[PDB]
mmCIF file with all atom_site columns, C-alpha atoms in Angstrom:
data_model
loop_
_atom_site.group_PDB
_atom_site.id
_atom_site.type_symbol
_atom_site.label_atom_id
_atom_site.label_alt_id
_atom_site.label_comp_id
_atom_site.label_asym_id
_atom_site.label_entity_id
_atom_site.label_seq_id
_atom_site.pdbx_PDB_ins_code
_atom_site.Cartn_x
_atom_site.Cartn_y
_atom_site.Cartn_z
_atom_site.occupancy
_atom_site.B_iso_or_equiv
_atom_site.pdbx_formal_charge
_atom_site.auth_seq_id
_atom_site.auth_comp_id
_atom_site.auth_asym_id
_atom_site.auth_atom_id
_atom_site.pdbx_PDB_model_num
ATOM 1  C CA . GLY A 1 1  ? 41.336 36.840 27.977 1.00 49.30 ? 749 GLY A CA 1
ATOM 2  C CA . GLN A 1 2  ? 38.809 37.887 31.079 1.00 50.61 ? 750 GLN A CA 1
ATOM 3  C CA . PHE A 1 3  ? 37.255 34.180 31.883 1.00 51.64 ? 751 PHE A CA 1
ATOM 4  C CA . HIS A 1 4  ? 35.574 35.047 34.411 1.00 50.71 ? 752 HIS A CA 1
ATOM 5  C CA . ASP A 1 5  ? 33.237 37.496 32.375 1.00 47.90 ? 753 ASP A CA 1
ATOM 6  C CA . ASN A 1 6  ? 30.386 36.272 33.269 1.00 46.20 ? 754 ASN A CA 1
ATOM 7  C CA . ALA A 1 7  ? 29.264 32.939 34.977 1.00 44.54 ? 755 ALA A CA 1
ATOM 8  C CA . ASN A 1 8  ? 32.631 31.385 35.443 1.00 45.03 ? 756 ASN A CA 1
ATOM 9  C CA . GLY A 1 9  ? 32.009 28.448 38.197 1.00 44.43 ? 757 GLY A CA 1
ATOM 10 C CA . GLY A 1 10 ? 35.007 26.776 38.303 1.00 47.65 ? 758 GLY A CA 1
ATOM 11 C CA . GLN A 1 11 ? 37.366 26.349 35.795 1.00 48.80 ? 759 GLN A CA 1
ATOM 12 C CA . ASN A 1 12 ? 38.352 29.526 34.487 1.00 48.55 ? 760 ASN A CA 1
ATOM 13 C CA . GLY A 1 13 ? 39.726 27.453 31.305 1.00 50.96 ? 761 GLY A CA 1
ATOM 14 C CA . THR A 1 14 ? 36.560 25.775 30.020 1.00 47.99 ? 762 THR A CA 1
ATOM 15 C CA . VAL A 1 15 ? 37.917 23.931 26.698 1.00 49.16 ? 763 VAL A CA 1
ATOM 16 C CA . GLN A 1 16 ? 34.841 22.445 24.213 1.00 54.24 ? 764 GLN A CA 1
ATOM 17 C CA . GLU A 1 17 ? 36.767 20.167 21.803 1.00 56.61 ? 765 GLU A CA 1
ATOM 18 C CA . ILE A 1 18 ? 34.403 19.735 18.568 1.00 55.78 ? 766 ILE A CA 1
ATOM 19 C CA . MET A 1 19 ? 34.536 17.937 15.875 1.00 54.88 ? 767 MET A CA 1
ATOM 20 C CA . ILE A 1 20 ? 33.741 19.704 12.149 1.00 53.21 ? 768 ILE A CA 1
ATOM 21 C CA . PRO A 1 21 ? 32.819 17.622 9.521  1.00 50.27 ? 769 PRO A CA 1
ATOM 22 C CA . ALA A 1 22 ? 35.193 18.236 6.369  1.00 50.29 ? 770 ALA A CA 1
ATOM 23 C CA . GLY A 1 23 ? 33.125 20.033 4.240  1.00 50.69 ? 771 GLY A CA 1
ATOM 24 C CA . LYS A 1 24 ? 30.769 21.230 6.598  1.00 49.96 ? 772 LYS A CA 1
ATOM 25 C CA . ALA A 1 25 ? 33.034 23.306 8.727  1.00 47.75 ? 773 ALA A CA 1
ATOM 26 C CA . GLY A 1 26 ? 32.561 25.982 6.124  1.00 47.23 ? 774 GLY A CA 1
ATOM 27 C CA . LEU A 1 27 ? 30.584 26.984 8.429  1.00 45.42 ? 775 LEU A CA 1
ATOM 28 C CA . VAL A 1 28 ? 32.103 27.043 11.459 1.00 46.92 ? 776 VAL A CA 1
ATOM 29 C CA . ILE A 1 29 ? 34.596 28.974 10.092 1.00 41.10 ? 777 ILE A CA 1
ATOM 30 C CA . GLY A 1 30 ? 32.640 30.895 7.737  1.00 37.05 ? 778 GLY A CA 1
ATOM 31 C CA . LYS A 1 31 ? 33.512 30.558 3.935  1.00 38.31 ? 779 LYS A CA 1
ATOM 32 C CA . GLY A 1 32 ? 36.638 31.741 4.609  1.00 39.85 ? 780 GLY A CA 1
ATOM 33 C CA . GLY A 1 33 ? 37.504 32.824 7.838  1.00 37.77 ? 781 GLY A CA 1
ATOM 34 C CA . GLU A 1 34 ? 34.976 35.562 8.504  1.00 40.86 ? 782 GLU A CA 1
ATOM 35 C CA . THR A 1 35 ? 32.214 34.132 11.265 1.00 41.17 ? 783 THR A CA 1
ATOM 36 C CA . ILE A 1 36 ? 35.239 32.080 12.447 1.00 39.14 ? 784 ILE A CA 1
ATOM 37 C CA . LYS A 1 37 ? 36.575 35.884 13.285 1.00 40.45 ? 785 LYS A CA 1
ATOM 38 C CA . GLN A 1 38 ? 32.846 37.102 14.419 1.00 39.87 ? 786 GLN A CA 1
ATOM 39 C CA . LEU A 1 39 ? 32.186 34.277 16.210 1.00 42.12 ? 787 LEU A CA 1
ATOM 40 C CA . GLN A 1 40 ? 34.864 34.525 18.724 1.00 40.81 ? 788 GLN A CA 1
ATOM 41 C CA . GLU A 1 41 ? 34.352 38.572 18.829 1.00 41.03 ? 789 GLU A CA 1
ATOM 42 C CA . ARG A 1 42 ? 30.918 37.718 19.420 1.00 43.65 ? 790 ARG A CA 1
ATOM 43 C CA . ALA A 1 43 ? 30.821 35.580 22.673 1.00 45.06 ? 791 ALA A CA 1
ATOM 44 C CA . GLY A 1 44 ? 33.373 37.196 24.010 1.00 46.35 ? 792 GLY A CA 1
ATOM 45 C CA . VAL A 1 45 ? 35.533 33.305 23.836 1.00 46.50 ? 793 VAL A CA 1
ATOM 46 C CA . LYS A 1 46 ? 38.488 31.962 21.490 1.00 49.35 ? 794 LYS A CA 1
ATOM 47 C CA . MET A 1 47 ? 37.456 29.412 19.227 1.00 43.72 ? 795 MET A CA 1
ATOM 48 C CA . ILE A 1 48 ? 41.100 27.852 17.672 1.00 44.13 ? 796 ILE A CA 1
ATOM 49 C CA . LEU A 1 49 ? 39.836 25.722 14.751 1.00 44.20 ? 797 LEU A CA 1
ATOM 50 C CA . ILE A 1 50 ? 42.781 23.114 13.637 1.00 38.11 ? 798 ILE A CA 1
ATOM 51 C CA . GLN A 1 51 ? 42.818 24.203 9.799  1.00 37.79 ? 799 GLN A CA 1
ATOM 52 C CA . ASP A 1 52 ? 46.200 23.852 9.094  1.00 40.54 ? 800 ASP A CA 1
ATOM 53 C CA . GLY A 1 53 ? 47.246 21.359 11.629 1.00 42.00 ? 801 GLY A CA 1
ATOM 54 C CA . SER A 1 54 ? 47.191 18.589 9.117  1.00 43.64 ? 802 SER A CA 1
ATOM 55 C CA . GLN A 1 55 ? 47.421 15.088 9.388  1.00 45.44 ? 803 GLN A CA 1
ATOM 56 C CA . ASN A 1 56 ? 43.116 15.245 9.873  1.00 46.37 ? 804 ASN A CA 1
ATOM 57 C CA . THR A 1 57 ? 43.186 17.836 7.841  1.00 45.82 ? 805 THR A CA 1
ATOM 58 C CA . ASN A 1 58 ? 40.997 16.103 4.753  1.00 42.50 ? 806 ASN A CA 1
ATOM 59 C CA . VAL A 1 59 ? 38.509 14.588 7.802  1.00 43.47 ? 807 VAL A CA 1
ATOM 60 C CA . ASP A 1 60 ? 37.137 16.100 10.808 1.00 45.23 ? 808 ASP A CA 1
ATOM 61 C CA . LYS A 1 61 ? 38.478 19.358 11.934 1.00 43.46 ? 809 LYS A CA 1
ATOM 62 C CA . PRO A 1 62 ? 39.817 20.010 16.224 1.00 44.03 ? 810 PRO A CA 1
ATOM 63 C CA . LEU A 1 63 ? 37.810 22.952 17.551 1.00 46.82 ? 811 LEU A CA 1
ATOM 64 C CA . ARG A 1 64 ? 38.621 24.199 21.154 1.00 46.71 ? 812 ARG A CA 1
ATOM 65 C CA . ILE A 1 65 ? 36.459 26.403 22.480 1.00 47.19 ? 813 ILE A CA 1
ATOM 66 C CA . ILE A 1 66 ? 37.852 27.896 25.061 1.00 46.86 ? 814 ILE A CA 1
ATOM 67 C CA . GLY A 1 67 ? 37.494 30.559 27.688 1.00 47.08 ? 815 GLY A CA 1
ATOM 68 C CA . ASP A 1 68 ? 33.986 30.645 30.194 1.00 47.14 ? 816 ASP A CA 1
ATOM 69 C CA . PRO A 1 69 ? 31.963 27.718 30.947 1.00 48.56 ? 817 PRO A CA 1
ATOM 70 C CA . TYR A 1 70 ? 28.844 30.252 29.889 1.00 51.56 ? 818 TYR A CA 1
ATOM 71 C CA . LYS A 1 71 ? 30.142 31.375 27.112 1.00 52.12 ? 819 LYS A CA 1
ATOM 72 C CA . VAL A 1 72 ? 31.759 28.210 26.085 1.00 52.36 ? 820 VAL A CA 1
ATOM 73 C CA . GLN A 1 73 ? 28.762 26.608 25.881 1.00 56.85 ? 821 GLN A CA 1
ATOM 74 C CA . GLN A 1 74 ? 26.534 29.137 24.583 1.00 55.24 ? 822 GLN A CA 1
ATOM 75 C CA . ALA A 1 75 ? 29.018 29.247 21.559 1.00 57.47 ? 823 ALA A CA 1
ATOM 76 C CA . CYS A 1 76 ? 29.159 25.605 21.221 1.00 59.35 ? 824 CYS A CA 1
ATOM 77 C CA . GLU A 1 77 ? 25.816 25.570 21.357 1.00 57.35 ? 825 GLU A CA 1
ATOM 78 C CA . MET A 1 78 ? 25.895 28.340 18.694 1.00 60.65 ? 826 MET A CA 1
ATOM 79 C CA . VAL A 1 79 ? 28.853 26.864 16.683 1.00 58.86 ? 827 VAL A CA 1
ATOM 80 C CA . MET A 1 80 ? 27.520 23.105 16.760 1.00 57.00 ? 828 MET A CA 1
ATOM 81 C CA . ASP A 1 81 ? 23.834 24.268 15.661 1.00 59.57 ? 829 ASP A CA 1
ATOM 82 C CA . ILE A 1 82 ? 25.067 25.701 12.441 1.00 58.03 ? 830 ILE A CA 1
ATOM 83 C CA . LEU A 1 83 ? 26.905 22.064 12.325 1.00 58.01 ? 831 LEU A CA 1
ATOM 84 C CA . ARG A 1 84 ? 23.114 20.507 12.616 1.00 57.36 ? 832 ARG A CA 1
ATOM 85 C CA . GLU A 1 85 ? 21.549 22.926 10.443 1.00 60.89 ? 833 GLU A CA 1
#
């Protein structure tokens, strides 16, 4: 977790919280969990998809993208793009 990977200007631990649509979550997870594994490694970040948190399991999904502010945003705009796609 080298948060200061490139442009960690400010808070090393930048958290991006997304609410993933119930069924469109399949995109962010990756049709079983393939894409999500890629997402973390491709951007060098950590994305916690609360899929098993329950309560809201039937609804929107709590996604916390944690890490460097520069890649956190790129990763946010990455998965949010798919979610607006």
